[PDB]
């Protein structure tokens, strides 16, 4: 005889903190969508050493997993995962609360906007150093997107009287709505400015 | 309902910090740690949460008396005569001016002692022998 966990007395049970659904989330960009896996996550975590393999579609990824991990990290020093998950658990809820839309969908929207079209590697050749503009490679767009969004959130927390979760929500929403106030979009638009020009 | 409030304190002499809660505010009083500070509040009978600035006049006046010497605690110098200098005066609290101006004397006293601690005070050098591989570059 029961007692047990309270959820719904069931159906298919949506997990992802038990709060939100992943399947509804659309990646508009046809190119981008392929790399971004959301055919069947939750939020628990996991490593798996998928290996670098190149050219064709490389590995599995969860967007969320990447976002928590960047936060613990950047930065700099001395961040633990129990706090790092916690801040996101709350951040997702702040984001949902601001938008009235699925937090994963906003995360997607942020990342797709912040991920530039083109970049600007620095090559020495002959007697001088040129930038000819360089590939984006679809995971690297994603990685850069998250990193940029993540530095911005940190920068705000440090400077202003705000906990991370809100700085992270704010920076993400702002990117997710195409406003230059976010660090992440401002750098995207710069990086694509420089890459187009330097050709 | 107010007070038209803000606060300026002399406190010990000429000093104001303020705008923080009394226990934490008090630590900044020369003489109290976090460790001393909380005890003085409850002995005075002011709450922890209330700011050192925010208080009414009677509560603030009790702070001035209590901190310098309180009811249940007290320390009078005792010993037979002499030793003369320096002495301990039974752990002066008494902190603030009387502590800072005490060590100024204690130094000359330590010199009239002929201590090394007194000769170094005369030599002028880092007192208790610091390392020289590197350091002191901001200091001078």
């Amino acid at each position: 005889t029961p007692i047990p966990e309270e959820v719904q007395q069931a159906q298919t049970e949506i997990k992802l903190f038990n709060k939100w659904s992943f399947e509804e989330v659309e990646v508009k960009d046809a190119s981008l969508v392929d790399y971004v896996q959301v055919r069947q996550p939750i939020f628990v975590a996991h490593t798996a050493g998928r290996y670098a393999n190149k050219r064709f579609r490389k590995a599995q990824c969860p967007i969320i997993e990447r976002l928590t991990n960047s936060l613990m990290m950047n930065g700099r020093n001395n961040g633990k995962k129990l706090k790092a998950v916690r801040i996101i658990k709350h951040t997702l809820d702040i984001i949902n609360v601001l938008t009235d839309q699925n937090p994963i969908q906003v995360v997607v929207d942020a990342i797709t906007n912040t991920g530039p079209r083109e970049d600007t590697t620095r090559v020495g050749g002959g007697g001088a150093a040129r930038r000819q503009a360089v590939d984006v490679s679809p995971l690297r767009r994603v990685n850069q997107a998250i990193a940029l969004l993540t530095i911005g959130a940190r920068e705000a927390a440090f400077r202003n009287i705000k906990t991370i979760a809100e700085t992270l929500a704010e920076e993400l929403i702002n990117a997710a709505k195409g406003s230059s106030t976010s660090y992440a979009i401002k750098k995207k638009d710069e990086l694509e400015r420089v890459a187009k020009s330097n050709r | 309902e107010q007070g038209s409030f803000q606060h300026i304190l002399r406190l010990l002499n000429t000093n104001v910090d303020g705008n923080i809660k009394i226990v934490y505010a008090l630590t900044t009083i020369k003489g109290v740690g976090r460790r001393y500070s909380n005890l003085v509040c409850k002995k005075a009978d002011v709450d922890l949460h209330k700011r050192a600035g925010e208080l009414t006049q009677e509560e603030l006046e009790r702070i001035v008396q209590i901190m310098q010497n309180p009811t249940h605690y007290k320390i009078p110098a005792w010993f037979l005569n002499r030793q003369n200098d320096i002495t301990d005066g039974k752990d002066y609290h008494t902190l603030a001016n009387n502590v800072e101006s005490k060590l100024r004397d204690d130094l000359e006293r330590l010199k009239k002692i002929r201590a090394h601690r007194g000769i170094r005070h005369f030599w002028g050098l880092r007192v208790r022998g610091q390392h020289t591989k590197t350091t002191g570059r901001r200091r001078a």
Binding site: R86, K89, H90, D93, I94, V97, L98, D100, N160, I161, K162, T163, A165, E166, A169, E170 | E1, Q2, G3, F5, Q6, N19, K21, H49, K50, R51, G53, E54
Partner: protein, 85 residues
């Protein structure tokens, strides 16, 4: 330094922000744009202190005008209103 105000508790005690102005303007006015907003986002946008927003939320809670949920870091969400369900 630059300087420095909203600043609490002394402003909290005196009438100027507690009475009406802060609870009605800041907390209550924000809510019609977003049904819920987090206690900490709400701190930062309003420019109101975390401690300062916290008692105001609590008065409002008692009233039944707002309803909080929780989380440890005294973060949570703040909601006003809501319904027929």
């Amino acid at each position: 330094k630059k300087k420095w105000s909203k600043k609490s508790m002394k402003d909290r005690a005196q009438h100027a922000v507690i009475l009406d102005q802060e609870k009605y303007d800041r907390i209550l006015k924000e809510v019609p744009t977003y049904r819920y907003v987090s206690v900490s986002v709400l701190v930062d946008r309003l420019k109101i202190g975390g401690s300062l927003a916290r008692i105001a939320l609590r008065h409002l809670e008692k009233e039944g005008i707002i309803k909080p949920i929780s989380k440890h870091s005294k973060q949570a969400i703040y909601t006003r209103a809501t319904a027929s369900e």
